RNA sequence: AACGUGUCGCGAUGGAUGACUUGGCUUCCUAUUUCGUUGAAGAACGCAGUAAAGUGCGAUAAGUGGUAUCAAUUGCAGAAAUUC
RNA sequence: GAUGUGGCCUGGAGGUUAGGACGAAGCUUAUGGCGUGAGCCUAAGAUGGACCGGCCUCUAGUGCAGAUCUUGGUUGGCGUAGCAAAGAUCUAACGGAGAUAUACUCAACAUGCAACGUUGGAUACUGGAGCGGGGAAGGAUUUCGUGCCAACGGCACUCGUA
RNA sequence: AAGUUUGAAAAGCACUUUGGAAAGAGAGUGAAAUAGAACCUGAAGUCGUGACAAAGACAAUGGAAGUACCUCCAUUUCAAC
């Protein structure tokens, strides 16, 4: 709140042969009298400074969330809307995809892996794979360097 | 050569301004030598200083 | 690092000055005249420069100076003798010959083919004005750079 | 646990760390010789040890570490050298990580962190 | 003619832009977390083989002691592996 | 003044497709193409050296020619105005890179000018209410010697309170 | 006010030559030296230079339509076409 403000700045009024806009007190050094306090000045303040009780959040009508997700889930069973997104599911063999309860069995990531290439949802974990690289611009230096699509989900009954 | 300290010590030693000072228009080497006062002193007794 | 290049590399001598602190104008003027000349006319045309016989004319950067009858053999009236910048260019002038003859080159064959004066960076200083002004009193030096070719 | 969420932070304290850390950060393979008879995968380099350069100009040179200076984050080694103007020999100096130990310097504290890293 | 006017190529002056950020700002959390006459916070002097600032320290002065580490520090110089 | 625009452009976020060391963004253009336009795309860099484009959606510190606008830089005026109170310097020698510095023709002048310090002479000024000796306040190493001339002493310096 | 942001690494330009020095001219390191040191890129504005276009005084700029000259550009044609 104090990020454009910290002077004494006053304006010199007319007659003095410079604009209005106030400037630093004092002398001897580089800013006495370089303009200040305005949005259009070097060191002032912004225009409308930013507020943390900005609205960030919202709300949603909870028959309208479950609404969006049954549709979601209406549309993930659909595979021409499944390929439209951006899915390779060439070699599934149905939509909606059901594997038996087993593979919480699992204890060995090698295992998952050959699970994967069996059910034939390894195509869209290759192409999430080959698609990693470097974020474009700020967020690489915002702790989003690394970017890639979005795979298969896997739904499983409990947190088991 | 410059002689400034030459003269400066001279004047002091001789208890005169600088413009009774005469430093030999010859002797510089000799003069530019000395670089106290005692060598002040042995030029003014051998007369390349007045 | 030169803007042109020489003709012929082997039969060409290039000497640069940088930040010569000569002012800018007065050596454009004078290393300007010397462009196209051979090496020992433009040496002889510094000597009489110096000796105030001959003058170095003054176009582009002439603004009231004075007028001279010197300047008639340059199809001009304005010209003037700036000594620092005819000994700043002798000595530059120099240099290239040096540089002929370690290359091999007859100095008496040398023709001046390019020269150019472009302003360096400027030195700072200050002046006292009425009423507690403090006003620039700047310094501009110049680059010059020059080859010559054998004909 | 130099590596974090937060890029920032992890690289100042890269960059900030420590000698001891820094000495830690600048580990090296051990060949598969060593790795065979020691279980160990890595190891902070250290003065005397006979290393092997991997990776970059000077790969396949071979030499012993002559100078750890971790403050270039570089280790100096005998055989790896180029001439200045002068003709004079300079050390050139080698990221640890682009280099593999080929025969450890071993004393009574080295082989206490030898035993503590071997995997067996 | 010369001054001067354009256009192109190459130079100069000048440090915008783009990339990169050990910085800032904002939000959230943890806890045997709250200085001082047993002399605090602030001021001032000083301390290194070499040492202006800065940092650290106080005539035990770029540190003594102890515990962990496990062979450096590093511009140059000086010294030179089990606690010592 | 209102409104509309599968209207253009900018920084980020979800997605989705691509591209890059056989060269990414930035930058340059008599460099062409497309669009009514905002603009977009290609080409070439004898540019650059590591990131980044398209499309759907989300988001905003999102578009400049001017505010006696802010900051930084540049610029004509301009080699111009001027650097004119306190009278002043000359001469030889020495010192200094600072000279007596030359392609041919050639006695020298007509082609190295001008400027420094010290010493000796000459000339002058201050004229004891002194550009004379000592102190306070203020300053604080400017004092002294040696070296030194980048910058500074608004001309100069080989001199200097540099 | 100010990013010391050269380069992967100082490998930070030995040596020769001119210069009183600063520097220049070569040479050398480096993939790069208009990467040579507070040095990545290096814009605009302004200036220098070489080449070319010309051009009275209509301030210059500007529109519309031609033409002269140029064009490291874009297309289309080169034969029963
Ligand atoms: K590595
Ligand atoms: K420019
Ligand atoms: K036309
Ligand atoms: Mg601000
Ligand atoms: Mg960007
Ligand atoms: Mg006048
Ligand atoms: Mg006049
Ligand atoms: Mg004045
Ligand atoms: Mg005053
Ligand atoms: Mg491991
Ligand atoms: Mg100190
Ligand atoms: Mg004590
Ligand atoms: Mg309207
Ligand atoms: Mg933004
Ligand atoms: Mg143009
Ligand atoms: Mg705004
Ligand atoms: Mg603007
Ligand atoms: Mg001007
Ligand atoms: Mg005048
Ligand atoms: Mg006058
Ligand atoms: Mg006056
Ligand atoms: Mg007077
Ligand atoms: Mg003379
Ligand atoms: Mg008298
Ligand atoms: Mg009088
Ligand atoms: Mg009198
Ligand atoms: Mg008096
Ligand atoms: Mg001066
Ligand atoms: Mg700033
Ligand atoms: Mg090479
Ligand atoms: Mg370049
Ligand atoms: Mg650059
Ligand atoms: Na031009």
Not at chain 1, 15 to 29: E, L
Not at chain 4, 3 to 22: D, E, I, L, T
Not at chain 4, 61 to 87: F, P
Request: net charge positive.
């Amino acid at each position: 709140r104090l990020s454009g403000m910290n002077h004494s700045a006053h304006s010199w009024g007319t007659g003095r042969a410079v604009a209005r806009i106030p400037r630093i007190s004092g002398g001897g050094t580089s800013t006495s009298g370089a303009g200040a306090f305005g949005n259009m000045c070097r060191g002032g303040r912004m225009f409308a400074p930013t507020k943390i009780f900005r609205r960030w959040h919202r709300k949603i009508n909870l028959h309208q969330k479950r609404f969006a997700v049954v549709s979601a889930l209406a549309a993930s069973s659909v595979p021409s809307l499944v390929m439209s997104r951006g899915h390779q599911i060439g070699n599934v063999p149905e939509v909606p995809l059901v594997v038996e309860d087993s593979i919480q069995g699992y204890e060995k990531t090698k295992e998952a892996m050959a699970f994967l290439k069996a059910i034939a949802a390894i195509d869209d974990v290759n192409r999430v794979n080959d698609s990693r690289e470097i974020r474009a611009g700020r967020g690489k230096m915002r702790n989003r360097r690394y970017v890639a699509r979005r795979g298969p989900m896997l739904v499983m009954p409990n947190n088991k | 050569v410059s002689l400034k300290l030459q003269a400066r010590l001279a004047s002091s030693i001789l208890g005169c301004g600088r413009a009774r000072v005469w430093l030999d228009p010859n002797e510089a080497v000799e003069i530019q030598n000395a670089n106290s006062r005692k060598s002040v002193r042995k030029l003014i007794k051998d007369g390349f200083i007045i | 690092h030169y803007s042109r290049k020489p003709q012929v590399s082997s039969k060409s001598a290039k000497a640069k000055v940088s930040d010569l602190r000569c002012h800018y104008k007065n050596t454009f003027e004078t290393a300007n005249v010397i462009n196209g000349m051979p090496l020992r006319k433009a040496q002889q045309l510094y000597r009489q420069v110096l000796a105030k016989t001959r003058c170095i004319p003054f176009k582009r950067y002439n603004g009231k100076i004075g007028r001279t009858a010197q300047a008639k053999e340059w199809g001009q009236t304005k010209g003037r003798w700036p000594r620092k910048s005819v000994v700043a260019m002798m000595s530059l002038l120099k240099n290239a010959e040096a540089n002929a003859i370690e290359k091999g080159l007859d100095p008496n064959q040398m023709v001046i083919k390019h020269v150019q004066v472009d302003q360096a960076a400027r030195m700072r200083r200050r002046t006292y004005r009425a009423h507690g002004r403090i006003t620039p009193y700047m310094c501009s030096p110049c680059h010059v750079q020059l080859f010559m070719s054998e004909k | 646990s130099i590596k974090c969420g937060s890029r920032r932070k992890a690289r100042r304290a890269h960059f900030q760390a420590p000698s001891h850390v820094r000495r830690v950060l600048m580990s090296a393979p051990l060949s598969k010789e060593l790795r065979a008879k020691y279980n160990v995968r890595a190891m902070p380099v250290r003065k005397d040890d006979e290393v092997i350069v991997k990776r970059g100009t000077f790969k396949g040179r071979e030499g012993k570490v002559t100078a750890c200076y971790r403050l270039k984050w570089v280790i100096l080694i005998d055989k790896v050298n180029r001439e200045k103007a002068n003709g004079s020999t300079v050390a050139v100096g080698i990221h640890p990580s682009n280099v593999e130990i080929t025969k450890l310097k071993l004393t009574h504290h080295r082989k206490s962190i030898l035993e503590r890293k071997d995997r067996s």
